[PDB]
Design an enzyme around this catalytic site. Structure first.
Site, PDB file in Angstrom:
ATOM      1  N   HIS A  56       0.066   7.167  -9.695  1.00  0.00           N
ATOM      2  CA  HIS A  56      -0.561   5.852  -9.585  1.00  0.00           C
ATOM      3  C   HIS A  56      -1.053   5.598  -8.166  1.00  0.00           C
ATOM      4  O   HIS A  56      -2.251   5.375  -7.937  1.00  0.00           O
ATOM      5  CB  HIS A  56       0.419   4.759 -10.016  1.00  0.00           C
ATOM      6  CG  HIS A  56       0.915   4.906 -11.420  1.00  0.00           C
ATOM      7  ND1 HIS A  56       0.157   5.472 -12.423  1.00  0.00           N
ATOM      8  CD2 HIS A  56       2.091   4.553 -11.992  1.00  0.00           C
ATOM      9  CE1 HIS A  56       0.847   5.466 -13.549  1.00  0.00           C
ATOM     10  NE2 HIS A  56       2.024   4.914 -13.314  1.00  0.00           N
ATOM     11  N   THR A  59      -9.426 -11.084   1.567  1.00  0.00           N
ATOM     12  CA  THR A  59      -9.391 -10.445   2.874  1.00  0.00           C
ATOM     13  C   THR A  59      -8.740 -11.403   3.865  1.00  0.00           C
ATOM     14  O   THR A  59      -9.180 -12.546   4.016  1.00  0.00           O
ATOM     15  CB  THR A  59     -10.797 -10.018   3.319  1.00  0.00           C
ATOM     16  OG1 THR A  59     -10.716  -9.280   4.546  1.00  0.00           O
ATOM     17  CG2 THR A  59     -11.750 -11.202   3.470  1.00  0.00           C
ATOM     18  N   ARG A  72      -3.831  -2.547   0.305  1.00  0.00           N
ATOM     19  CA  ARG A  72      -3.935  -3.306   1.544  1.00  0.00           C
ATOM     20  C   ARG A  72      -4.574  -2.427   2.606  1.00  0.00           C
ATOM     21  O   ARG A  72      -4.090  -1.323   2.876  1.00  0.00           O
ATOM     22  CB  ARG A  72      -2.561  -3.802   2.004  1.00  0.00           C
ATOM     23  CG  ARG A  72      -2.580  -4.536   3.332  1.00  0.00           C
ATOM     24  CD  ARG A  72      -1.236  -5.176   3.622  1.00  0.00           C
ATOM     25  NE  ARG A  72      -0.765  -5.986   2.504  1.00  0.00           N
ATOM     26  CZ  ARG A  72      -0.882  -7.303   2.431  1.00  0.00           C
ATOM     27  NH1 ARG A  72      -1.454  -8.002   3.398  1.00  0.00           N
ATOM     28  NH2 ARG A  72      -0.417  -7.937   1.359  1.00  0.00           N
ATOM     29  N   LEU A  82      -5.687   3.829 -13.888  1.00  0.00           N
ATOM     30  CA  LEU A  82      -7.130   3.976 -13.754  1.00  0.00           C
ATOM     31  C   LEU A  82      -7.885   3.056 -14.702  1.00  0.00           C
ATOM     32  O   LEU A  82      -9.064   2.773 -14.464  1.00  0.00           O
ATOM     33  CB  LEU A  82      -7.543   5.428 -13.990  1.00  0.00           C
ATOM     34  CG  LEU A  82      -7.281   6.377 -12.819  1.00  0.00           C
ATOM     35  CD1 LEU A  82      -7.748   7.780 -13.148  1.00  0.00           C
ATOM     36  CD2 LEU A  82      -7.953   5.865 -11.558  1.00  0.00           C
ATOM     37  N   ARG A 118       7.377  -7.715  -8.699  1.00  0.00           N
ATOM     38  CA  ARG A 118       6.467  -6.748  -9.294  1.00  0.00           C
ATOM     39  C   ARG A 118       5.102  -6.910  -8.641  1.00  0.00           C
ATOM     40  O   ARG A 118       4.564  -8.021  -8.596  1.00  0.00           O
ATOM     41  CB  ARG A 118       6.357  -6.957 -10.805  1.00  0.00           C
ATOM     42  CG  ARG A 118       5.243  -6.167 -11.470  1.00  0.00           C
ATOM     43  CD  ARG A 118       5.550  -5.925 -12.939  1.00  0.00           C
ATOM     44  NE  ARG A 118       4.409  -5.370 -13.658  1.00  0.00           N
ATOM     45  CZ  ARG A 118       3.393  -6.086 -14.119  1.00  0.00           C
ATOM     46  NH1 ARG A 118       3.335  -7.397 -13.944  1.00  0.00           N
ATOM     47  NH2 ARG A 118       2.409  -5.474 -14.771  1.00  0.00           N
ATOM     48  N   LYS A 119       4.547  -5.812  -8.129  1.00  0.00           N
ATOM     49  CA  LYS A 119       3.267  -5.887  -7.439  1.00  0.00           C
ATOM     50  C   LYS A 119       2.675  -4.496  -7.274  1.00  0.00           C
ATOM     51  O   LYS A 119       3.337  -3.595  -6.753  1.00  0.00           O
ATOM     52  CB  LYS A 119       3.425  -6.555  -6.070  1.00  0.00           C
ATOM     53  CG  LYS A 119       2.116  -6.800  -5.344  1.00  0.00           C
ATOM     54  CD  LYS A 119       2.359  -7.475  -4.009  1.00  0.00           C
ATOM     55  CE  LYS A 119       3.134  -6.564  -3.073  1.00  0.00           C
ATOM     56  NZ  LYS A 119       3.420  -7.220  -1.771  1.00  0.00           N
TER      57      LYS A 119
END
Ligand SMILES: NC(=O)c1ccc[n+]([C@@H]2O[C@H](COP(=O)([O-])OP(=O)(O)OC[C@H]3O[C@@H](n4cnc5c(N)ncnc54)[C@H](OP(=O)(O)O)[C@@H]3O)[C@@H](O)[C@H]2O)c1
Ligand SMILES: NC(=O)c1ccc[n+]([C@@H]2O[C@H](COP(=O)([O-])OP(=O)(O)OC[C@H]3O[C@@H](n4cnc5c(N)ncnc54)[C@H](OP(=O)(O)O)[C@@H]3O)[C@@H](O)[C@H]2O)c1
Lengths: 488, 488, 488, 488
Positions: free
Chosen positions: B236, B375, B343, B176, B338-339
């Site tokens: 998360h 986008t 979406r 957050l 890592r991501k």
């Protein structure tokens, strides 16, 4: 089988021909986009040859030594026929030359009229009566300007239409061949992120901008009789308006697109004199060279002319999608830069919870230069801040698509004529609506000769244009800061 | 007047403390974001000193020789008190130390509980009974994990709420405090380009992705008892879901935001076992080093464990905005990268006039790494083409805002606690809804011990997850080609 | 000045003429809606007189003794000329009779072709070559049927268009002259309560119903060669579909309306055989008289005919407004009642908070009988209940507007032809789209002669039609209870 | 098992009790809607008996000879206990009486406070300290007025909340128990025809009307200290506003509804003095009886009072749904009729193609009298006309639902209290928002004592109210003609 094609260039010795059309057809042939059996015939009054046209047009072809063989192959298929624009015998000579061409009897004939408007009637009637192919199609190309007002343009349009069908007439608005102008359709009708918001409930105003950093630069006589309105506003900005404001077509067929465009055009009232800001540029005593002179400093401009070199006009499309949304057409020469741009200023977000620190979203579609689509959006300020700040979601051609060479508008338009695509050309009824929108204003200005608001050369134009934009609803803040990024 | 502040660090000798909290408070003091009269008190069982904590925490401060004076001033205001988590006498000692501090009687006390969950009850009860300031405010900070299921977390949450008010409890979800997670609110409620489309009429599915290119890397005992679900999905991805799916708050006040978040949470049904794809990673015999081992190859992992290191879960928010839209939470460790990413795959554009070569728009908000909002949109193919192609309107932080240093999430969260902002913290009712959503699934998995779908280390996880995504409505094409630009 | 008008009735002795056209023109003259200088000329093969036509048409005029003087004045302006449909001399005789009429040289001539389709070609060519007024306008009226399929109708439409312009051809679809069918436009485009919801995001399916409580009743030979599809579905239900599904016109001008209608027609794919339920009615042994016989019981019907007297067809308009919404055209003769009705079943309300006891809203526009617009809506159950129940917001003509006499469709259509209004008439391109939509299905049925699903006389038709409606998305519950009120 | 229930009526000898509460509970018992083991205890200062209360309340029960046995059974379970509102001994006497009741120890106790506001504090504290059931639930009912301004009401609300929880306090707004006021929720959130249009993009203004055809009629002393604002606008019209403007709740649970209502209330700014039209009624010399006197003609009204008997107030809900839409609260006594009504005037239809003869749609929800929902819509003029005319889609209770007897609001509210439903009651925070909206205006009027605009008795009130409505955006045309139909 590959059908034989003929590219007839009327006024082949003309300025427009040797500057844009011959290089355009050379580039089309160089990339192998023309049909294999394609020949090009030049036609004008001057008694020139293929070699003379070649020498005159070489400095504009931008050829390279690696393309020499293609150059002779292109010029081996070029031809020139001298004649008159009213004598029929020259036209039977041209027809005989085209028939003597390899398989010219059934060849598809394409005529480009790179001629002054004074000879279009004679050229079209002679072409229709003498130079029509009986087997392949025949498509004629007419060029701007299309008349001077509603009646003058309507008479020429009716004379042309009385001779050719709407699928044979190809009216050039070379801005319709621009990359971003054509991308407008895909942006609008291929994306769900631009569909629900493309209406009066979210868009506050529409701004269509055309700027040139130079004035008439010496040849002010031609611009005096037209002015900025007839020159730019009536065709370029108005077709941009039609593409921005159109309804979704039933298909990508040309007729559906042009029907939507004329439907949008039919919903615009005539221009009121109270919504127009006219300016005529005066020289800058601090100017550099050509910037030191104003419009009245041109010797060819008649003394005491009130012709406007800047215009800001507010239009309204009275339909269920655009009711009340001002369409600000702001064009001007000798301004501070060169720019063609579509700007959609959206409404304030309802129920603002960010203490008036937010600003109106702006979807910007910059046609030229540096083709780019970006939407001005409010993002959270990067770092240890909570306030929103203006940013953009940017797609810039030339950085994302470097290897892709965006072609010239004339190249794409002529390729469309060769392929029979008529989506990006002006229909007769579109021209009638365009001229009837602006004719009362033009006639009132001509009869009243009002004095424009002088603006210094290289400036942004009259400030009363900014006052008009503020009055009609457009909000300018000046707090948007943008920096070109680096080291991606 | 600047009020005196005290920063009490419970378990100051702990791993989390010396790795993240002490550097965080040092960075906050270095930039002058803390109040001028701010002191920091360390508390743990180990009999350490200020010098020992300094030496242990220096390799993580990333200090520079130009900041030696600031470092000395920061550490001159640091203190350590050793004690016990259940003995009251240590807590009266800590209270006496805080009172002996400069103007500590009215100082604002802030407690960070960097302790294992087993001692939260004792620490909180002792702090409430002995270590409460009578003049300034007292805010306590509790850390993940928040229980193991609905009842285990509910008992601890009710016990803590019985001692402190909701404006005193600061539940940490460090996602957050991420830059893009906080930018979500501005994106949603400050822009008119994202308002009319943020609903079920335009959004086909929502994908929330959490990937790690490494597994449990040796310390698998702690991850065995929790799994990927409790570790990532419950907090998360679910808070990301709440921020994405929330209604617009009445104001930017914390209570309105948390009310909207809990309102969204209350509209999610319990997770069905048929919408879950569980995977446990097996080593890659072609792997490099740590990639050669799987989850079962960890000696500390008990033999024959069915714990899942990958999860794909489909959730539904049964309200008027999100009815029927699948919310795909796809998380997994030992994946190919890592991501953290939001979406939004939009629906197909109705009345497709481009012969089915258009694709669904995707608004992507990449939290980490390389913070960027883009986008996925359909633009006309650059060059001599008419077909649409997938492109993006991209805003990448670190290229547009390279000079701005995006701070750590802990820095921003602790600054918010100092400022009294509770927008980005977990409320009790949010925790109850989060646990009741996933508790039946966790209990069923625990009691049934199903075998997960093995996936090779460094891969994209089980293919049944992609089957589930395809089944629930998500469309994956694989034809989107993106290139990082250069030389802008 | 009042221009002289002539009302030429081709086939004046015909069934349609003496049953509908002569009473229609008498009613138009009686209310003073015709131009003051209006004359009516009868033309047919039979050697009748004005007195004979008067005696034949009196039982259908519904005149009263208070209108005797108006009756003789109307019949004093009536005339009859006998002739042939292919002999020119009769047409020069008719022209001479019209010229001998008072100011007939400049009189506006109006031709009504109340003739079988076999003679339209000869009648139209003769009228164009001999019976055209050189001063006033000339408008011709052609009557259903318009061909049998795409090519048969296209040949006649092209032949007629080769002789008359689109502003001179008036194709009759008498359902376009109905009160509620014309009220459709005002309902759609004059009210903000029906605008934002008239799309695929809120409408689940569209049902267009045409019912007759009687079969072919003896004269089955004419219905055998057409069937229910060509008779009703191709024209009445399809024009109702066009009016329901059209976009908002630029203005109430006829051309804009017909452009919108043809634009909607162009977006419909050809009818698939798997979306059609065909039925042929069998007699009811419990039937009362005429109801005891089936379609095969008609002596004039050839033995072993597979002609369908009931049809349920699902259509789709692939545009941005109607993508995926089924348009159910359900028509049938010898059904349980007479009813023409537009029904719009809306989608389920998203985020249902009433525990699934709500039902889909239905906006119902009943064309005939008992003209009424009502929307089926969920209201709170009156009394000591909290559950919602189905109710309606009802506007019933004949109760709200009892004093107003709703005129016949033919009266209004002929008045529109007199006034030059062409909004409610079939254009050529509309006819082409209508025939190309249904032609493959008709050809497949003709070449395959499938056996229809028998349904007892006076029933609701085949149950497979209700299966098709349920399959395509339409929801039928049967729990809607309605009672006609009293003593308001 | 049926739990025992006790209905304690505080101030049983009071006006409100004997006029509404005793008949309400008698009607509830008569229809068998109360629990089987239900007893009613009367409590007041007067030394009355069950027989005395029976004789006093009989003329308001509207009993019939067919309900005699039910009447004695109802009165056989009625009881009365005399006491004091501050003496505890009376309250222990009442508690002992309730315990002596059949199974009164575990009986569910329900208290109705039909008392003046001056004694609520003592009554509530005594009930909490002495008369609380230890097994069954205890729910207390407090009655209008709720204070005089923000602080006076806040002190009482905080005192009551300090003794009882929010699920035990039942604040009465008897308009929340009205049939149409409760039907508002079903209308809004059960129908797709009222969802997409219930926003600022379609609604131009909101009018909430409360009219009485009589003034204070003799007892003007009580109305002088409150005025029309505190009497009607602060509670009835404002709760109607909350129900009209609320967001869709997560469920039909009471807490979600009240959360949405308070969320809407929190988004209203304080009332500006320039948006208020105040009127005080003067007698009509052409008046009839009571109509001949004005407000100043009441002997009990102090001389020279500026109290307003009419009010027109414009409110704004600055949120994303209602930004800029005026909410006109127009109430007044001694007006021309009695009417409580919700009117939603929609915006003009964009792109008007009917030459400005269309008018704004109005959805009207008439709470009383003649409960009806109708939407003012534009339909095509019946007959031989093409222009649109104003009509309505009408649902009138009492004609569609004759046999259904719509119950009194008090009946339904008390049944809700018995069932534990708290959806239709005023929460504390709703009361705080309601009072803070109007407190500055009330204080300014009190301190400034402005002179109201006199209006003749039985008229429509001051014309400046109609000027204010016109100024803020409401359009009044006066061309809407409506006739009650007949012979359906
Ligand atoms: N940048 C541009 O130049 C530009 C841009 C957009 C549109 N256009 C339009 O394209 C057309 C081509 O004109 P241009 O720009 O090439 O100007 P231009 O050079 O003056 O005209 C080109 C040719 O027109 C013929 N011509 C000139 N004056 C004539 C007259 N009085 N009567 C008959 N023929 C005459 C000449 O043919 P001969 O040499 O055989 O005598 C000349 O070669 C124009 O109508 C122009 O409006 C031009
Ligand atoms: N990356 C992270 O480490 C991370 C991330 C997110 C959240 N957290 C949370 O932050 C909290 C801090 O834990 P950590 O990561 O620092 O792990 P840790 O190093 O094992 O625990 C830190 C301190 O907790 C005390 N402690 C350890 N075992 C204990 C026991 N059995 N009884 C009482 N006290 C004990 C020790 O104090 P003494 O030294 O005085 O004995 C130790 O210094 C944890 O609850 C963890 O879930 C950690």
């Amino acid at each position: 089988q590959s059908d034989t094609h003929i590219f007839i260039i009327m006024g082949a010795s003309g300025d427009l021909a040797k500057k844009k059309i011959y290089p355009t057809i050379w580039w089309l042939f160089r990339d192998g986009l023309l049909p294999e059996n394609t020949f090009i015939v030049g036609y004008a009054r001057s008694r020139l040859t293929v070699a003379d046209i070649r020498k005159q047009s070489e400095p504009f072809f931008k050829a390279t030594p690696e393309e020499k063989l293609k150059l002779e192959d292109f010029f081996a298929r070029n031809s020139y026929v001298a004649g008159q624009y009213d004598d029929a015998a020259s036209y039977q000579r041209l027809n005989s030359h085209m028939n003597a061409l390899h398989l010219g009897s059934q060849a598809n004939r394409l005529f480009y009229l790179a001629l002054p408007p004074t000879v279009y009637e004679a050229v079209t009637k002679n072409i229709h009566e003498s130079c029509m192919s009986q087997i392949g199609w025949n498509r004629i190309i007419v060029e701007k300007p299309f008349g001077r007002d509603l009646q003058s343009s309507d008479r020429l349009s009716n004379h042309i239409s009385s001779l050719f069908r709407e699928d044979q007439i190809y009216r050039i608005n070379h801005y319709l061949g621009k990359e971003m102008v054509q991308n407008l359709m895909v942006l609008r009708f291929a994306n769900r992120i631009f569909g629900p918001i493309w209406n009066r409930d979210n868009i506050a105003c529409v701004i269509l901008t055309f700027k040139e950093p130079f004035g008439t630069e010496g040849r002010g006589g031609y611009f005096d009789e037209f002015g900025i309105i007839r020159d730019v506003m009536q065709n370029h900005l108005l077709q941009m308006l039609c593409l921005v404001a159109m309804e979704k077509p039933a298909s990508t067929n040309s007729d559906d697109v042009r029907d939507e465009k004329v439907k949008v055009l039919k919903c615009i009232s005539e221009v009121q004199a109270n919504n127009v800001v006219l300016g005529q540029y005066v020289g800058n005593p601090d100017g550099e060279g050509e910037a030191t002179k104003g419009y009245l400093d041109d010797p060819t401009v008649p003394r005491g002319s009130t012709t406007a070199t800047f215009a800001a006009v507010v239009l309204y499309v009275e339909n269920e999608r655009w009711d009340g949304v001002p369409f600000i057409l702001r064009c001007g020469k000798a301004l501070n830069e060169r720019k063609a741009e579509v700007r959609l200023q959206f409404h304030d977000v309802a129920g603002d919870i960010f203490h008036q620190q937010c600003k109106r979203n702006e979807l910007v579609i910059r046609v030229q230069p540096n083709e780019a689509v970006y939407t001005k959006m409010m993002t959270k300020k990067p770092g240890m801040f909570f306030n929103p700040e203006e940013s953009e979601l940017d797609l810039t051609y030339g950085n994302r698509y470097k290897n892709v060479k965006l072609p010239d508008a004339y190249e794409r338009l002529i390729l469309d004529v060769f392929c029979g695509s008529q989506m990006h050309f002006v229909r007769s009824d579109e021209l009638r609506e365009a001229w009837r929108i602006f004719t009362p204003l033009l006639h009132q200005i001509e009869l009243e000769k009002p004095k424009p608001i002088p603006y210094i050369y290289g400036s942004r134009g009259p400030t009363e244009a900014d006052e008009l934009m503020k009055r009609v609803g457009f909000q300018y803040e000046g707090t948007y800061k943008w920096v070109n990024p680096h080291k991606l």
